[PDB]
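Reproducibility note. Readers wishing to regenerate the assembly model reported in the main text can use the exact inputs given here. Chain order matters: entities are listed in the order in which they were concatenated for prediction.
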Amino acid sequence: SGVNLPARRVIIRTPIFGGRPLDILTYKQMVGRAGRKGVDTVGESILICKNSEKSKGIALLQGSLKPVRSCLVTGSMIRAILEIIVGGVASTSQDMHTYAACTFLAASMGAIEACVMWLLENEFIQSTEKVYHPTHLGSATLSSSLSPADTLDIFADLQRAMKGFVLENDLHILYLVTPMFEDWTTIDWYRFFCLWEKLPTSMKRVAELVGVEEGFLARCVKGKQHRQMAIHKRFFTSLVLLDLISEVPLREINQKYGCNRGQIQSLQQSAAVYAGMITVFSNRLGWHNMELLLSQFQKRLTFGIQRELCDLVRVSLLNAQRARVLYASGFHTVADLARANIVEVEVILKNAVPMRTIWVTGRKGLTEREAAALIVEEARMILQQDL
Amino acid sequence: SGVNLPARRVIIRTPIFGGRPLDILTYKQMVGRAGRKGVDTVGESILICKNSEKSKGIALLQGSLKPVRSCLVTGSMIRAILEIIVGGVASTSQDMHTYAACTFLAASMGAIEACVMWLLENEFIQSTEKVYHPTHLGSATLSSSLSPADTLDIFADLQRAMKGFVLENDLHILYLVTPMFEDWTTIDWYRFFCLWEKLPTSMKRVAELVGVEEGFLARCVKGKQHRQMAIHKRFFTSLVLLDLISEVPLREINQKYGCNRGQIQSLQQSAAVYAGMITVFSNRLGWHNMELLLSQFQKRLTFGIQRELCDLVRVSLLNAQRARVLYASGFHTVADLARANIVEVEVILKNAVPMRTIWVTGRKGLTEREAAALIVEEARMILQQDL
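Running the prediction on these inputs yields the following structure tokens for the assembly.
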């Protein structure tokens, strides 16, 4: 499903992928890169099958793409009518029924009106004379673009951090921005238990405040609760993220946190969007205090930086190390980094090693002299373009 | 002790001022304003005395102001040596002894060396080979310019916001920036009881978290503890300040809080400096989360504004109401207020009334047309001067 990678021959291992038979839809694009344009006159695909799996494998070849559905109570439809009647375009209920005639479900060829009653119960909508108006929670959910199922828990979760908060460590703030667990990694309970003990006093205060139990943490799972499960794995996601924003090496996290570097960036990129949705959610809800605390946490999670390097990282060519080593060079802000000597940044960038060898996202490799000049050149444009 | 107020005749009511005899030092400048330069050829003062008070009154006429002292364990000397050994100028103890030879005490003509030991006990200085070096707490106190006596309590009080913090209301943030009680007003306990009951649920949570007791608050004082007494007054000072930053009418606070407008601005100006010292104190101590919450509270306490008008108030001619009515005119930031139509701001400033009739601090009265032009004109100069 990613970027095109042309090749003359594409060979597949088994029709069974990850313990399940291969889907037809992915099979159309499975080998569609075979045959380069204007270079290869023939592209071929060779699915490898064994014993009786050939009967299942050949179904991939003669199969046709499954017809599309609409997947539309349904959780994907609650947002559908919330997203429109909260924008003010659709107010009358009869016009809403007309909108449901415009969906994919309607064009394919009852409970649409009953889903509004679901929104009435959860205070998302105030009932008037029927003509419907948004509430404070309803207008905040749309603007931040959260699913209404998740918001009901967040609003109570964020209102429990109302009463008690900690500020010396970034953990409790990070706990409110960790999205979920999904299946980003396989948990290691014994390793978590050793990590649970070695946690300092300040961080352990956070866990008790959000429902995580010191007595039950990597204790009962060894010897053997869905909402209690979703909290402990939320805590592990927050525990991992705090090391990410502490600029610890990613190799060290692998040896310590057990999750490979592939699943880390698949989290910090996903958890950075969450911090960008909680912050907007708290802005529209009139909570000006943790909107301040969570304001800087979207940039920190995206790049895995500290508070110091927030301004340096604004240049697109400084991801996580090109700003740290540059920070130690006496340059602490992007304003004066824009005025840096071109020859000065060459030597400092050469050191700190863990012709087009230095890499920058979007332009493949680059040479050190050009990239170092790009560090300053990008900083020139930012200074006047934003002012 | 204030601004020069020339007058031809000055009359003093009694030698007794507030139940105490008048001080000679203020008596010299009591009369010193009599006689205008180049206008009045004769200035006189008539002290008024009765019965036996004349003997006390006449003593000031033939008396002389007392000679100066040095006021230098002593609390004003602890900061004196902390101001020099933390700045790095004086490190060796023997050289520090020469500093005590340079003060007013030495020039007038033991415990100085016994007072640096007091700082050693309270972690303010680390002891090395004697050569003294500042600590994290020692360097933070100097930068924020707090008395070392007050810092020991603040450090244990600010660190008690680590345990639990509230963010729905500004009360807990305000409680940590209320300086003290001094004698800014006379407390009204029965009036505080009626106010204590009517406090919403969110604010009452703050009081229990800082030591204020719901069970004992305007309860035992009616029927009849220095550290406990200084907390309850600290809470009352925070309750008053929360109304100040809510832009409630100043007249309404009098009818509700019992303290008149004179002691209000003499406290919000004093509490604004405190927020400017706690913020710097937390900055140097490496508490980046706490500095975030208190960063905006120096500007809010000075002007009695909300978060919305923080940017508008940057113009020196918008104190507390010239920005609120201007805010409702569709102008929410100082960037676009600088581009406002000159004739447009005239009509909006005319309304909201609770030729030089409008007033701006420092330039006495002004006319509406000129001041409204000054509103934009000051905004012109700010935009490019800071960039």
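We highlight two features of this model. Strands of chain B lie at 9-12, 16-17, 20-21, 44-47, 125-128, 131-134, 358-359, 365-366. Chain B touches chain A at residues 159, 161-168, 170, 173, 202, 205, 287-290, 292-293, 307, 387 (CB under 8 Å).
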